[PDB]
Structure formats: C-alpha cells, structure tokens
Design a protein around this ligand. Sequence first.
Ligand code: A15
Ligand code: A15
Lengths: 316, 316
Amino acid sequence: MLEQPYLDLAKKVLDEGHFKPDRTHTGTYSIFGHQMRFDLSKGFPLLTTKKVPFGLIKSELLWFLHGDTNIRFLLQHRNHIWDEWAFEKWVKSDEYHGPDMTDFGHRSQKDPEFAAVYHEEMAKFDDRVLHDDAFAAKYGDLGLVYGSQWRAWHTSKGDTIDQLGDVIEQIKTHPYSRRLIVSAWNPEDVPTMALPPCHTLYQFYVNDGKLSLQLYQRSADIFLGVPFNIASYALLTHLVAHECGLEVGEFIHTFGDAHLYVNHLDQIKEQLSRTPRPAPTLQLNPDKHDIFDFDMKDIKLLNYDPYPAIKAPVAV
Amino acid sequence: MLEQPYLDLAKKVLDEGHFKPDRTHTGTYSIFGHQMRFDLSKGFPLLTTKKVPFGLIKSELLWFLHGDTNIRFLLQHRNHIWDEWAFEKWVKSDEYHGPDMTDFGHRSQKDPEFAAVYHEEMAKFDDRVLHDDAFAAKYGDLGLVYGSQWRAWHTSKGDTIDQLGDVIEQIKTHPYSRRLIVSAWNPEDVPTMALPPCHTLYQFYVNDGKLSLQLYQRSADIFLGVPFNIASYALLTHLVAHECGLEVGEFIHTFGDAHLYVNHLDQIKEQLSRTPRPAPTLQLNPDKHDIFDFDMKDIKLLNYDPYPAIKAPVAV
Ligand SMILES: O=C1OC(c2ccc(O)c(Cl)c2)(c2ccc(O)c(Cl)c2)c2cccc3cccc1c23
Ligand SMILES: O=C1OC(c2ccc(O)c(Cl)c2)(c2ccc(O)c(Cl)c2)c2cccc3cccc1c23
C-alpha cells in the first residue's frame, strides 16, 4: 500500500538501528541515510494505520506559505505545534512574573501539579497573543522559522529573498531546471538557533508534466514526527503543482539521521501489526490557483478512514 | 564489489531514465532521487572499471580545505578543472584583446583551428596566472566557490564563517550531534552564480566510533562527473576521520537529478561489460593530523589497478 515505505522504515530502525543516546535524556535507535518514495498518483500519503490529524498539517503549511512567523495564526486555528518555542522566550524575558518554568518540558511529565501550573501559564500566554496585538508581535513572532526562511531570507545587503516565490516562477518558465531548490539552512543563524531546521533543504523536478519534490531531513522522529512530515511535503507538492498547472508525480523523502525514541517501541510495534487501508485523496479548489492566498477550506481530504490514534509520550 | 552501486546506477538510468533535454544542446536521460551506499571499510571507492585520475581529486580537495579560491594552486599542480570558469571572465573583461571567444566551449568541438586558437589563448591565460601575481588575484580568483563557501561564508554583519572548521570541532566535542552539516548553497548568490554548487549540502554522522558522510548532489553527470564526485567525498570522510581520531564508516551519495548525456551511451555501455577488480586502499600520513595543513604527499592510494580510461566528449 502507499504508506508501506514508512512502516518498512519503522521495522528497519527496530531491526538494524544502533543504540544512540542523545541531547534529551531519552535515548534513541538511529540510522543514517534512508530514502522513501511515494507515488502521489496513488493517493495522499497520510497514515491509515494511525490517525494523523490532517488539520494541523494544513494550518501549519498555510502559515508557511503566508511567510508568517507569528504563532497567533496557529492559535487562531487551534494549532499549538510551536507554542512552547514562543512561550520559552516569554518565561525568560524580564516582564514575566510567575513560576520558574526552567526547561518546563521535562518537569511537565515527572512532577504532578507543576504540569497543571505549566498548562495554566501557557493558557495566559496564548490568550495574550490572540488579543494583545503588542504582546503578539513581541513574543508571538518567532523570527527565524520556515515561514521567513522560505519567503523572507535576509541578505548581507540588508534586503529579503522570496525563495519559494521565485522557484515557482522558475518551474513555470524553466521547468527542466536542475536548480529548483529551496533551503532553510543558514550558516549564520544555525550556531545560535534553538531548533535549527530539521527539513534542511528541498528540490523540485519536472518530467513529462509531472512535478516531484525531494526533501532532505537531517533529523527525524519516526513515530511522532515523520507521519506529519510526509503529509506536509506531499501536500506542498500538490500546491506547487496546482499553481503551475502540472500533474503530481512523486515525493522523495531523504533522511540524515532517522531515529526512534526508546519509549515509542511498543507503540510502533503495535502499529506494525495494523493492515493499511486504501489511501485517501486530496481535493484542491479548482477555481483558486495562487496558493499563497490559499486558505484552509481550499484543501479537502477524502476517503480518510484511519485506525484509532496511538498515544505516546513526547521525548524530552 | 565496492563500486557496484555506481554501475547499478548507470544501468538504471539507461533502463528507466526518461529523456530530458537540457540547458546544453546535448540532451540527457535523467532520474530524480537515488542513493548509493559505500562501506569505506572495504576500500576507497575509486573506479577500477575505468581509470579515474586520483591526482586531480587530491589537488582539488586540498584546494578546498585550504579555503582557496584561486585557480593558481590548481595550475601549480597541473590541475585544470576550473580554468574555463576563470578564463571566461578574462575574455569578457575590457583588458583582453584577441579573438571573440563567445561561449568557446561549444565552438571548441565544431570548428577546427578555432579549438587551437582557444587552447592557445588559454595557455597565455594560465601562464599569466602562475607568474603575474596581480593577474592571478584579479582573474585567477573565482570568489564564490567551494573553498570559500566551506571555509569563508559571508554573513550579513560583514564577517566570515569557517563552516567546516567549526563542524570538525563539533564532531570532536559533540559527535552524536544531528547538526553536523555544511552547506554550499546560499540563496543570495544562487540567482546570479555561473554554476551554482552541484554538491549542495552534506552531513556527518558518528556511531560506534565510525564516521559517515551523506552528500546531497542536486545534479550529476553519471559518466564523467560521478566517478570523481564519489572519490572526493570518500576522501573527505577519511580526512575528517583522521583528524577526529575516528574510524571510517560509510559514504552515502544522494542525488537530486542524476543524468547521462546522450553521447556517453556507448562508452557507459562498454564500461558495464567490465568486471570490477578488488578496491584500492588509502594511506593517510599517521604523523600529521591537522588536515587543513595537509599536502599532496600526505595521501596515498595503493593497489589501484584499473582498466584503461574511456574517452568521451564533454557535454556542451
Ligand atoms: O532539542 C531540544 O529539545 C527541547 C525542546 C524539545 C521539543 C519542544 O517542542 C520544545 Cl519547545 C523544546 C527540550 C525540551 C524539554 C526538555 O526536557 C529537553 Cl532536555 C529539551 C528544548 C528546550 C529548550 C531549549 C532547547 C534548545 C536546543 C534544543 C532543544 C531545546
Ligand atoms: O551549464 C553551463 O555550461 C557552460 C559550461 C559548462 C562546463 C564548463 O566546464 C564551463 Cl567552464 C562552462 C557551457 C559551456 C559551453 C557551452 O557550449 C554551453 Cl551551451 C554551456 C557554461 C558556459 C558559460 C556560462 C554558463 C552559465 C551557466 C551555465 C553554464 C555555463
């Protein structure tokens, strides 16, 4: 079935993965160098052996296309994927006055009550973003994130570069170009960034009318991250294809370090004993063709009938 | 045998490659997304089914490690891989006074005598580089090339970044880092560069003491380029391993668009009917450990007994 390459990866890291302790106290099983190929003509590669919330994928990708870097948009969509990154800079700024919140992520699963304190503090942070415009622009804006690096790269000569925007024109006027590349890696910011881009660099390709995209992911969290990652880029390909009036081809997922956190073993194992159902389909508004102006409603996912979700502790 | 992955690629592009005309008048057969794995413990991946001049690989890589961007070094080693790029800017500069030399590369194989004129003009260009220091610094320096982008990336804040140098320290003090990355792609320079980096981005990896490197090549010339490319990076891995006192592991070669120019068909086909001999070995000076100061003599290749070279026209 379509998603087989993902399961084959999970089974692989379990069988051939060498134990590798990492940054977080939770150890991992990792491998280096892997590639998966998904034929987008067979359907949208969203996992059926587990219920991945497609909503979040949309909410985040559109955020990216809009050159947005403010968490407000996501909170305004019930998406909370980046909250912690912004909140972190809030508890450190000499303006916040409450609990210590030192590396809260870890304490949020080892000490009861504190977690409630955390979720409580987070609620006020999030609330002040959606309503207090000044607060939103101060702590809601991440600055260095996919949205800006994709569509507002900063030059040495004080200006900005619309990478994706240009590459799209390129596909349109020079489809056979082997230079259809977009990078999120900037040597200048990387030494100090909190979380350097995992989805380091991607490339487009056009052949016989079908568009394809390869993604170089320097790091991957097989159980939690990868299921989303695949969807984001499978979607991104459709979008770029929709605008360029091209048919959709393949999505090639290349990994640097693909890993599995130890406390996800039983969950992934249980997932491996699930037979995949037929892949879903994606419906993109046939009228609207300028993806940057796209909105949630302009993307539909049909026949998605996945298995129940699998609860697993986030690694910290 | 060790190099099998390369031959398997050639056979693949011939069998599954879709015809794709390109920038140059010579068409190609190309594919998108491929990965080759070489176990450096079995030997240095230099082709035995064809005689690749290892000398040039050295000459160029050391040039890179030295943060050099001046062709003089290469000419001072009989290496002429980058000559044309520098020479091109010489025939355009209002100081040169001789033949037109418009896109000489193409005319150098269609019109007799002109080729002799070209090689003649080139001789004077090269000569004036090795001897006239002022000329060397003006036209011998390429500016934007692997040497500088690896070891002298320019920031927006008017300074420079020693990417490779830092990453090496990183391997030493944080080997298990999933961020051991070096990029040659800069969104600011890419829109105007003559030849944007083919070897777009690479990543290191450490596990059980063995170092490994993955290379993302957005474009590849299977017959002419790839044989060299593999060697350069297989060597680079050994060097970084030598300094970091680590053992050598694998070299993962990932491709964006891997292609084969039509006028290389018969040559590659003839190469495919050649049985590979045992792989050679690499000897790195056991005394010297700081690779940046490495010199030609510090690298040895043993048991290299390849087949005769295969002459093939360069694509233009
Ligand atoms: O790699 C990280 O992870 C952390 C992380 C991870 C996921 C996530 O969504 C968020 Cl916001 C934060 C993190 C968080 C809690 C911890 O207990 C530890 Cl050890 C590390 C993290 C928290 C704070 C600063 C950080 C700086 C660099 C790398 C991480 C990092
Ligand atoms: O992609 C290229 O290739 C060219 C090339 C290729 C290999 C090489 O070592 C050198 Cl220096 C130059 C080139 C050269 C001769 C030609 O007839 C044509 Cl069409 C194109 C080339 C020559 C001049 C300017 C160029 C600008 C962009 C891309 C190329 C390019």
